[PDB]
Symmetry: C2
Subunit: 87 residues, 2 copies
């Protein structure tokens, strides 16, 4: 399909993994996770937000894989919501 | 084409305006201005960056109009480069 991403609880794609194809207003409520330590964008372009409901700091994810938060330009693994860039 | 945006030096679509369809690594050099106070996204989806060469804070622009910087989630008129999200 057009949108798909895998997010991991630990860096270097380790720990538990969750896969999704839709926007997520709160990763704590949906995935019971406080942070994202690494991920892989398999399809589409996405954006990470610091706070719930797409508020706070924004990070564009337009590459393929990210082993650590620094790879998507963040000084911390803090992420609470994310969504697809629809086009 | 797929990407087109108009940037304004003053809020609410007033003041000097430039229309462009390509990425801009530095507005001071390309457009002889230092702050964008409003803008219209006519075609495509873009992203504004705090510092030149796409560095610093990021702001997604996926709606059509923004009357003030706060509308793209910025606390100040600080934006010095921007580019198209090519999908």
């Amino acid at each position: 399909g057009q949108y798909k991403i895998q997010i991991f609880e630990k860096g270097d794609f380790s720990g538990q993994m969750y896969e999704t194809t839709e926007d997520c207003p709160s990763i704590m409520e949906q995935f019971h996770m406080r942070e994202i330590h690494s991920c892989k964008v398999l399809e589409g372009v996405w954006i990470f937000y610091e706070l719930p409901n797409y508020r706070g700091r924004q990070y564009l994810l337009d590459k393929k894989e990210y082993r650590k938060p620094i790879d998507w330009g963040a000084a911390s693994p803090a992420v609470q919501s994310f969504r697809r860039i629809v086009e």
